Amino acid sequence: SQRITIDPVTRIEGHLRIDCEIENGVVSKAWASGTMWRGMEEIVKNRDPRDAWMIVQRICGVCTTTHALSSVRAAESALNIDVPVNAQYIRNIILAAHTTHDHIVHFYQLSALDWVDITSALQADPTKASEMLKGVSTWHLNSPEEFTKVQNKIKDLVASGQLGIFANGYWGHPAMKLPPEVNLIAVAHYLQALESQRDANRVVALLGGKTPHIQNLAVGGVANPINLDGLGVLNLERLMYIKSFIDKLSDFVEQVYKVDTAVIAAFYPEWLTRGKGAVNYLSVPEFPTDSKNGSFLFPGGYIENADLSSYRPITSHSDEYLIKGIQESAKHSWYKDEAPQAPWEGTTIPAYDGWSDDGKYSWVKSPTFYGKTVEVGPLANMLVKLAAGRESTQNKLNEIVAIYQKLTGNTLEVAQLHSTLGRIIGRTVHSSELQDILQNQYSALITNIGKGDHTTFVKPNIPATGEFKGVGFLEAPRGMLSHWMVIKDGIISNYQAVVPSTWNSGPRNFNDDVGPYEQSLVGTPVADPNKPLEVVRTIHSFDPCMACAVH
Amino acid sequence: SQRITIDPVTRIEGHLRIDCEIENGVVSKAWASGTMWRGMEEIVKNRDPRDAWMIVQRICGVCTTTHALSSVRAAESALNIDVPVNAQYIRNIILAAHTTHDHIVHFYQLSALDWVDITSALQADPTKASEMLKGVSTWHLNSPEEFTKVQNKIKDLVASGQLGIFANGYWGHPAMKLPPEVNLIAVAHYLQALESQRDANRVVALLGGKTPHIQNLAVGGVANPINLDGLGVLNLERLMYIKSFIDKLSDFVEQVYKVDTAVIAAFYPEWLTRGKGAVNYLSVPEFPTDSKNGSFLFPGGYIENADLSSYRPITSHSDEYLIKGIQESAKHSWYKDEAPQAPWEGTTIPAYDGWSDDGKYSWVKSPTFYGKTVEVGPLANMLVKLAAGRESTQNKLNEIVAIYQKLTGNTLEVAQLHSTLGRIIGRTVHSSELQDILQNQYSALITNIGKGDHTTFVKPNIPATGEFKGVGFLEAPRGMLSHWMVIKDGIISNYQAVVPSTWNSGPRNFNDDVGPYEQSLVGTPVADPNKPLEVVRTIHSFDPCMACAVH
Amino acid sequence: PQRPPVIWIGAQECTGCTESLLRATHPTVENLVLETISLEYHEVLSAAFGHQVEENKHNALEKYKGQYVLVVDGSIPLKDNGIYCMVAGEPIVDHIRKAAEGAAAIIAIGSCSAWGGVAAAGVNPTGAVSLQEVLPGKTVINIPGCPPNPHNFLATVAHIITYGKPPKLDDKNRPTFAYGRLIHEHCERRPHFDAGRFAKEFGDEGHREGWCLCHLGCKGPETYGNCSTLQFCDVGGVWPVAIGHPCYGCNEEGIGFHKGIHQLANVE
Amino acid sequence: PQRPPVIWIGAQECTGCTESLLRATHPTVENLVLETISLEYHEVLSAAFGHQVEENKHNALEKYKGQYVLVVDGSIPLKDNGIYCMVAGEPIVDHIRKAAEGAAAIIAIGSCSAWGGVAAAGVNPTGAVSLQEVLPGKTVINIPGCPPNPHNFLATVAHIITYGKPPKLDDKNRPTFAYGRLIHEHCERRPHFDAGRFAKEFGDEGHREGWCLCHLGCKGPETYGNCSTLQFCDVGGVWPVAIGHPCYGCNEEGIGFHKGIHQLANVE
Ligand code: SF4
Ligand code: SF4
Ligand code: SF4
Ligand code: SF4
Ligand code: FCO
Ligand code: FCO
Ligand code: F3S
Ligand code: F3S
Ligand SMILES: [Mg+2]
Ligand SMILES: [Mg+2]
Ligand SMILES: [Mg+2]
Ligand SMILES: [Mg+2]
Ligand code: NI
Ligand code: NI
């Protein structure tokens, strides 16, 4: 029996502390803590509703774009503005391409070194490694020659004595299970991923004006001026350039990222049977395509008690059932007001008093849906799509399963998706489906401009009296995001963000119920309490972002 | 005796006609004819000497940069201007990067389809094709998967019925000797080459302001403003960007282009025994590195009757022996004045009277060196380097020969370099040595700026009376280039360009001696006189450019 | 899926306009020829030569009559009955007129085909003229520059393919997305011009701070183009003025190849 | 061969400043960490976590005493004894001060560390301040922007490595190659400003011809930076104004996060 702390948790965005009680070699109880606060909700208060998005985008630069888009949607909700369809297409392209970058970086730069041992890679035979992937991937950069160059770079790094970010890593740990050859394959893919994520952000930059932190939005649409015949604006040459980067993403996603996901599951199959965070899941529909902020390409919904068969669909960002369920508590958080609050009536009054196991121990609030804890993010979004009978999602999941089957002789059932590896699989499925979103929305944009519609912006009016409430929903890389704006006498009188990492990472709630990160760790085997790799494996599967969770 | 005409010769720059007399299936006599003239020498006359380079660079856009650099060197010669060393480093990087692009495009886009059969590539086994290269190349993009993707692109093209650039090619010709697998390898490399040649021109563009047709020169140096601390000028960030592209070129050149050169020689060994164009060879030294227009990184010289042991070194662009020997005749060209003319006293008076076998048949003049015919270009430049005992050149040739020996069991001796394949090998060796020129000169620039030298330009004065003469030499991608300028009362009173393709392609001279293209074709076997692929093989080895040859 | 056919004829060209395609990225030249179009005749890249390539041209002119885009680079020389450019024993102007009869659209790529360019300058040794001058009955789309940014051409082709008509043109038949504004009316050095901050010689203090190049002979004030915005080579920051040299006016008739590098523009 | 060591500490950051490195091309992030530097501490990319990574930091501060470049992103909160940002149970201001004692050079990357930025805006809930405010006896090199172009940082580090000293700095300790000039004093839309050609609303006719964004709230007239020249992401033509949105002044204290998007700049 003993008490450990993991502080800082690395290979996440932001500042996270995890504490665990370990009994008889397994975690028996856990605490998640966000250790940095800025007060972004207070910073944006009393400003013009049109300004909010440029300020609150700075909640996070990893999930850049997301808070910007959620903020304009919130002001649009309050003001009753219908966004021009060309502005929906542009916003959708940006979100889809951003998310592609975000998920690739998570799987490789943030998560792979939980599962992959770089020292073991030095022992690999590059020819045997290449041979292992025959009939498993058609990727053009799995040759022995590619793998030998990568092995030599690792060799040179180790020989210099300056391991830097690779130093004091969990090399030779008993939970590291890959053969040398598979370790070398993963490091080669890690480096290749950096090129493909750059291509995704070239899409974002051409519409956003730069990334991180896009600058093309507005309450009322976008600032891109569509004119096929115009010099220095969004013309056909610029659109062709965008398309040239969209076309570069699919092969990496399908032939490297999707395959590696199945390979990791095949070598770590006990991770299909642990890391369950919740029994309830929530996602919002995303990528609207009509003239009235609807007709979403991806569905949403609510699953209760893991029952896909009886889920409740959500098809609108104005759904009163969704809106009315959401509250946050600060009983075990460092804020003053503790009872559950609907976010239009939310407060964020700091009340730091240090760490207590049974009192306050985090800057993250505790969100609930009609009083229940809920997991959000790619596992939620996948399970909802399967519940909706979405064929695209079923088919892509089956492709990952088939690779797993071929490697192990075993299959994967939906029950095994409620796990650390299931969560990773949801993220990979999302990434693959986003490539069809990109092709679909580029084609829609080209077709619509061809009909003679170049409209991008509806100038808002904001009444100087009255009190108006708006909420902007968005299915972000890490799950359902919502910004809640109250306008009074022309200015922002309340602003509250409820962010996907808030739902997952938040501490024990008003009824002392346990949220997803803390719940997922119960039962985790920990072979060496001084080097708790197994805990970090499960926490990474949620893709934590603490600037997002706390703001 | 049969008479054939090949008009147009394609996969060159510009407008070329080749005629051949054929006796019993063997070429007995040939005629080379440049069929388009612009009169660029007359267009540039009567202008300010400072303006010439912008006009005469338009002699050619394939060998862009080269006439620009020769023209400023000619005006600097006439005016006695010493070029700042930083301007030399910048000029040198541009020429070396440009020449890398140019040679890569020649070997693949221009020449490969003489030796490679695309229909035979469709029958290849991609796994066997990859296996053939094990232990022969370390290139990272020779996998079966890469090769299969390439094969499918060709399959789709053929299936469409729209062959385009590939339509009516020499597929199944008896002179096509590669097995299916090697045909497929070559097509894969043809495609890959397009990306590497683009990286070489990114170097050119960052210093030149664009390419084709650079815009950073001046009589007196360059227009690039060196300031490590300046916004909007050539600072350390811009220099770092240039270096990022220089670094991308070497692996392709060494592991693909150099290897394919040896492989083509291994399968076509009879092409080491034909296509000799001359017994005399000329090259000029290139890449000056001092403050007085000298200290060249590459050597030059003159070889007479193929005797490397008794060659004459040339170490200065002011060499009076070089200068005095160069003349041109128009006896068999469509100009009026026929006796050999030194270029400072040259005329270009058009006198077109139609084709005559024994009279005038070309817009190309006939250059001589002290009355002899001479071959210029990468064969000349390689042989001079070997005669000088340059270890770099010896070693690079030996690497090609080692690959060839591995495949055939045979070595290559110097006598076998006086051939169609020898000319191709000289070009590949040049391309490889140019990568060291780029590293050397980038490093020299960074170092010199670090010492506090930011100088780039010496403003000229041009006397308003008097007559004076200058000549600018340059070792271009296709051989020795010279521009000859006479200034009288402050303006250009004569301008003559003697271009490397002029040396090689020129018609019979004042003494009816036969120049290199025409001499190289005697003895060529022609299996099908309707489809004379063997003639085009030898002519393409010289890398013809008829805009250059004729101007 | 069939691809739209293109026939490319070179007249008094330097080949810079074809070479521009080897710098393009959207599309790259390999994607252009395998995915975007069917390049039915192009002498720089064609496997076939001689009588076989002339067969290819004749077959394409028939099979695709009324459907192909005809592209010409280089000027057309009229002096002495066409003999300054002969291909397969005939004057190039005859090849061009015959191909123009069946064309769906006709494009003059580069200053030489658009208005005569460098080949028609000075004394004009060969009586070089423009493509529009040899085809008086046709609307020739002009894409000037020496050579233009290849996407000025490629996005014109793509508008024809995707939307079934040419892009909008100015009164010289140049696409407005690329040639609709003076360089000086969209130049990042305009603030320096406005303040009297001028480089006087290359390498001087103002030149080394990125000041305006007007007093070095910049022709931006009298040249239509997109060189300051689209720029060149898709790496960012690359055009002649950004590199430190004045615009020479290569896009614009009566400017490039006529005025001296250091001759001042007229300012309007 | 040994690489120069770098220690990177995040305070009240959004991680945008680290994410800028994933867009860089010269060097790419992979070449940065394998070839250019030895990244001895960076919490976003480190294999090690918790005790092991704090071991790496302590080891590196001793091993490389006097030799490493210290980089901080985010503001430093001083309200209530530093508890608004706590790492391994201690205020980030204490981590930063300890690392600063042995630094060869110290860089504030982003507007938050350079001057307080968005985190210090409005009522300043956490008493956020700049890196230079936390380190009054040290020369801090300021690389502002939200986030800056990553090469503003990487070429500063490169000047230190290659030439043995920082680049030339202005009176706010910003490198002159990147922050030496107002955006409005090198903006390609200045001609439109000068002629009174102004967009009035997004999507109007002037906006759709690329006119000046001054009357939409452009802060270019009062913001130092290289956004119009170096621009962003190395694809060519990409910065906020070129996309159609005014500059917000994110580089500049008292402009970005203080003035409204549509509030007009003071113009000199
Ligand atoms: S416009 Fe210029 S680059 Fe094009 S063909 Fe004429 S001379 Fe060459
Ligand atoms: S004169 Fe040339 S450099 Fe100066 S502002 Fe005009 S176009 Fe730009
Ligand atoms: S300057 Fe901006 S991008 Fe950098 S840490 Fe501060 S908020 Fe994030
Ligand atoms: S106000 Fe803005 S868009 Fe207009 S010229 Fe100035 S910086 Fe450019
Ligand atoms: N994705 C993302 Fe960031 C988080 N959590 C947001 O919103
Ligand atoms: N290289 C080249 Fe062109 C030719 N011949 C020149 O000079
Ligand atoms: S010379 Fe030509 S390329 Fe543009 S900058 Fe001037 S029009
Ligand atoms: S908002 Fe920032 S990124 Fe540049 S354009 Fe303005 S300083
Ligand atoms: Mg309106
Ligand atoms: Mg909140
Ligand atoms: Mg001299
Ligand atoms: Mg000549
Ligand atoms: Ni985030
Ligand atoms: Ni040439």
Tab-separated table of C-alpha atoms in Angstrom, chain A residues 32 57-59 107 123 174-175 186 221 272 302 395 399 429 433 450 453:
chain	number	residue	atom	x	y	z
A	32	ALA	CA	-6.955	14.452	-11.165
A	57	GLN	CA	-9.488	31.406	-29.021
A	58	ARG	CA	-6.493	31.836	-26.691
A	59	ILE	CA	-7.948	29.346	-24.235
A	107	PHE	CA	-1.182	9.349	-31.579
A	123	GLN	CA	18.212	-4.188	-31.872
A	174	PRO	CA	7.972	-4.846	-18.095
A	175	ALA	CA	4.813	-3.352	-19.623
A	186	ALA	CA	6.732	3.089	-34.898
A	221	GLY	CA	-19.790	34.406	-41.156
A	272	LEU	CA	-9.112	-3.566	-24.308
A	302	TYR	CA	-26.656	10.782	-25.686
A	395	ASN	CA	-17.073	0.050	-42.109
A	399	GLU	CA	-11.226	-2.303	-41.278
A	429	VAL	CA	-11.871	6.258	-36.888
A	433	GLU	CA	-13.907	9.881	-41.617
A	450	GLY	CA	-20.331	28.181	-59.568
A	453	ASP	CA	-23.243	32.611	-54.648
